[PDB]
GROMACS .gro file of N, CA and C in nm:
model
  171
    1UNK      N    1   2.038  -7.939  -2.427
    1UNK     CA    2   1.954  -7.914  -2.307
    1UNK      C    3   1.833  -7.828  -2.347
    2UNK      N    4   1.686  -7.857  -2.400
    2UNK     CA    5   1.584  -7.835  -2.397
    2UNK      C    6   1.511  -7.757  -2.308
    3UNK      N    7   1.519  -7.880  -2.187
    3UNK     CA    8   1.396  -7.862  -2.049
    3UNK      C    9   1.281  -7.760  -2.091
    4UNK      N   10   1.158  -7.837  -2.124
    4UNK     CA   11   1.004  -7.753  -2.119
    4UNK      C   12   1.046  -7.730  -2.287
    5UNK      N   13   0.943  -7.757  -2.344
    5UNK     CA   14   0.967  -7.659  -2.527
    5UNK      C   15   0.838  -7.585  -2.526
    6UNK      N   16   0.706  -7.598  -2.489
    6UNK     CA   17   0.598  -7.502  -2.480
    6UNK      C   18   0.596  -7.449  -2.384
    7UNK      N   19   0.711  -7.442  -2.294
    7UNK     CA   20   0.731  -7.381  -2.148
    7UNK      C   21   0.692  -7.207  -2.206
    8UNK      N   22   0.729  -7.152  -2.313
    8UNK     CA   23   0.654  -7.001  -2.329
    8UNK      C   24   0.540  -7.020  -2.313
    9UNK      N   25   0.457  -6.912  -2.258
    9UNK     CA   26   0.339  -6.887  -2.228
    9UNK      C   27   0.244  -6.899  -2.392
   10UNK      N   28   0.221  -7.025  -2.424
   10UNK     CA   29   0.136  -7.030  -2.538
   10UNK      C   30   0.023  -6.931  -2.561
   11UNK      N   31  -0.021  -6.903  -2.439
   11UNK     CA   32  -0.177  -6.894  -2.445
   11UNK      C   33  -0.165  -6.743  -2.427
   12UNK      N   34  -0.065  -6.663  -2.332
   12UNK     CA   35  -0.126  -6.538  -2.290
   12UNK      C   36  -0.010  -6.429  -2.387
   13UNK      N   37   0.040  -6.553  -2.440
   13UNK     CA   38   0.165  -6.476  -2.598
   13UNK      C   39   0.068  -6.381  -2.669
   14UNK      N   40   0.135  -6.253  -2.754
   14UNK     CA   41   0.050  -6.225  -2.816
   14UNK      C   42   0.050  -6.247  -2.941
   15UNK      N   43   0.017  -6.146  -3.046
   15UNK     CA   44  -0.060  -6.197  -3.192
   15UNK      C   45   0.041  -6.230  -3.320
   16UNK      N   46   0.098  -6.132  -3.312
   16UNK     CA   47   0.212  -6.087  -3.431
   16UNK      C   48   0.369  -6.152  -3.336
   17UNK      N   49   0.351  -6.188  -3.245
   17UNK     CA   50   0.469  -6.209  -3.222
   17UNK      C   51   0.451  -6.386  -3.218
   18UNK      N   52   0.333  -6.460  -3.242
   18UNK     CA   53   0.314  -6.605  -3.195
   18UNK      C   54   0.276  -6.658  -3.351
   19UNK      N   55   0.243  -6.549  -3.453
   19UNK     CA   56   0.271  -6.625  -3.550
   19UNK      C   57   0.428  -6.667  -3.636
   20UNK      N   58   0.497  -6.638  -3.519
   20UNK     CA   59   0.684  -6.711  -3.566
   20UNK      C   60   0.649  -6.828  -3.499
   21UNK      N   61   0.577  -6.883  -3.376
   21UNK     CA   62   0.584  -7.042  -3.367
   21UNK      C   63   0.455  -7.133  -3.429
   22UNK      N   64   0.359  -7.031  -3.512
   22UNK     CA   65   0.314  -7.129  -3.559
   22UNK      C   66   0.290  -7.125  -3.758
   23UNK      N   67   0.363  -7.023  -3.817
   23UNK     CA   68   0.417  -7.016  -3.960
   23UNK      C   69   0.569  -7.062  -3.952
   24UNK      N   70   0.625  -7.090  -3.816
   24UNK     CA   71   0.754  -7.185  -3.873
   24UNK      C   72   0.780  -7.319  -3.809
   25UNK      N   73   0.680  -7.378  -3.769
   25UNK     CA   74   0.659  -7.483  -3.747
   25UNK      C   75   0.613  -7.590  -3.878
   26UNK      N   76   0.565  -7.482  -3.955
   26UNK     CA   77   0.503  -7.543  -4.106
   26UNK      C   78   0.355  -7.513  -3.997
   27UNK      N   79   0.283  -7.439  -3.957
   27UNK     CA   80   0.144  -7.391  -3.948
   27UNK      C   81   0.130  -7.260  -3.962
   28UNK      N   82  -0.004  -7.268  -4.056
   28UNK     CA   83  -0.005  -7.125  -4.141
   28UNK      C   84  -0.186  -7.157  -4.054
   29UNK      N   85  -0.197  -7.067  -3.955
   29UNK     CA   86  -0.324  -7.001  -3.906
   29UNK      C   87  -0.362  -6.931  -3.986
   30UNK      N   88  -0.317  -6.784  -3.981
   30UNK     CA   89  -0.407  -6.699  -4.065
   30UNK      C   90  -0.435  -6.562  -3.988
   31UNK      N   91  -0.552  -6.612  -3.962
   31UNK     CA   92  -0.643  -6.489  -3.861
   31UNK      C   93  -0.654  -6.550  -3.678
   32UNK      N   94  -0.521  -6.455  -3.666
   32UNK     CA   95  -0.514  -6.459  -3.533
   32UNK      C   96  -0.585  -6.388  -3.408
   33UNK      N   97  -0.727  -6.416  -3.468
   33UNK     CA   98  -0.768  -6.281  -3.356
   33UNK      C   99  -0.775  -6.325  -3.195
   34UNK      N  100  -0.854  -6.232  -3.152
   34UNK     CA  101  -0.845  -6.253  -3.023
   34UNK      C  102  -0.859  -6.357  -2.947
   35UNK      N  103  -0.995  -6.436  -3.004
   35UNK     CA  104  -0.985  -6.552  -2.951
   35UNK      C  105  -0.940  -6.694  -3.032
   36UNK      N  106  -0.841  -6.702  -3.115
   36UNK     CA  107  -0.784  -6.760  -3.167
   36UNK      C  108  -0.640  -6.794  -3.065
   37UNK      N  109  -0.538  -6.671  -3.050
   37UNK     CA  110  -0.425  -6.724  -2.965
   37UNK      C  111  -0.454  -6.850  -2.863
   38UNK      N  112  -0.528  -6.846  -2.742
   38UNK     CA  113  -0.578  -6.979  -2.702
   38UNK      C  114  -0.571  -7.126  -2.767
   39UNK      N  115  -0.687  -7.109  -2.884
   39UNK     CA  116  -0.683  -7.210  -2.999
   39UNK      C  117  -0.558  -7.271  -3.047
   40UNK      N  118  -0.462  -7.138  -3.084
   40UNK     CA  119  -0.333  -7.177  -3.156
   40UNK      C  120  -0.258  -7.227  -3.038
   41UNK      N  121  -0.291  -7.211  -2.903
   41UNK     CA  122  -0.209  -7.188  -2.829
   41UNK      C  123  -0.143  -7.388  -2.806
   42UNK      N  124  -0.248  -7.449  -2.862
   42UNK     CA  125  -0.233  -7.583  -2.856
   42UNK      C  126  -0.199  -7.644  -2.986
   43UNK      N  127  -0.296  -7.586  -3.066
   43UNK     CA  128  -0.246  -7.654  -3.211
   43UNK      C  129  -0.125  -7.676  -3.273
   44UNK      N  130  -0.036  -7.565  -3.234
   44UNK     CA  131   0.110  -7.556  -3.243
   44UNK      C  132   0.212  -7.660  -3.159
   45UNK      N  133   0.141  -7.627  -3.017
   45UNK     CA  134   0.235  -7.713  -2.927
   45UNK      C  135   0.204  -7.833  -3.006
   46UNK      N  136   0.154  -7.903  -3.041
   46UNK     CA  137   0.149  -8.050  -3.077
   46UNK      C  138   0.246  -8.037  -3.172
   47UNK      N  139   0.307  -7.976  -3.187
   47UNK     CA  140   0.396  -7.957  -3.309
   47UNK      C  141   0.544  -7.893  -3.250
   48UNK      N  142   0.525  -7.889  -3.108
   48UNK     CA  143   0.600  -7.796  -3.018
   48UNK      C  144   0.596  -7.809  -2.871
   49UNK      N  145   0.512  -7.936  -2.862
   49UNK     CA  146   0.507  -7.992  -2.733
   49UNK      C  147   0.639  -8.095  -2.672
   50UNK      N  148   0.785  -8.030  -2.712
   50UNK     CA  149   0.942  -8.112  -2.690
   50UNK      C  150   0.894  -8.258  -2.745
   51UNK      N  151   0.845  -8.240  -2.862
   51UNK     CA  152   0.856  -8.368  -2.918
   51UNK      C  153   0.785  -8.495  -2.840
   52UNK      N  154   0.860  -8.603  -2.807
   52UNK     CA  155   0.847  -8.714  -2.765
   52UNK      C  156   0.903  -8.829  -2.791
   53UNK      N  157   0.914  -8.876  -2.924
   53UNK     CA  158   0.993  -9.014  -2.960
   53UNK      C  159   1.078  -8.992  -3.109
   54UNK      N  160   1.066  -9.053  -3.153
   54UNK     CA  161   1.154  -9.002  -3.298
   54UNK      C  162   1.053  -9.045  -3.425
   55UNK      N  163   0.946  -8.960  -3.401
   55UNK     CA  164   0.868  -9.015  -3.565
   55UNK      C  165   0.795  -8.888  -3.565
   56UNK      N  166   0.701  -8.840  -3.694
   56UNK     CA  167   0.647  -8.736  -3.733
   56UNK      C  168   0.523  -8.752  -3.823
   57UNK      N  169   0.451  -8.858  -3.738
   57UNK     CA  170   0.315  -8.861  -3.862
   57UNK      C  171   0.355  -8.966  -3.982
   0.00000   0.00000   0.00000
């Protein structure tokens, strides 16, 4: 039972605590500054958006 997988607040998450969903997703951002979280706040979900079908690129 899943229900929602980017259901955390992507966007208003903060810095040091949002690079665990996107350095263990296999995405290495970097420089998370301020106006980056937003940015990441999607780049990740695609990687964290509950999936969808059974393939990976």
């Amino acid at each position: 039972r899943q229900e929602d997988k980017d259901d955390l607040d992507v966007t208003e998450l903060t810095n040091e605590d949002l690079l665990d969903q996107l350095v263990k997703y296999g995405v290495n951002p970097g420089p998370i500054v301020g106006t980056t979280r937003k940015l990441y706040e999607k780049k990740l979900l695609k990687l964290r958006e509950q999936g969808t079908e059974s393939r990976s690129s």
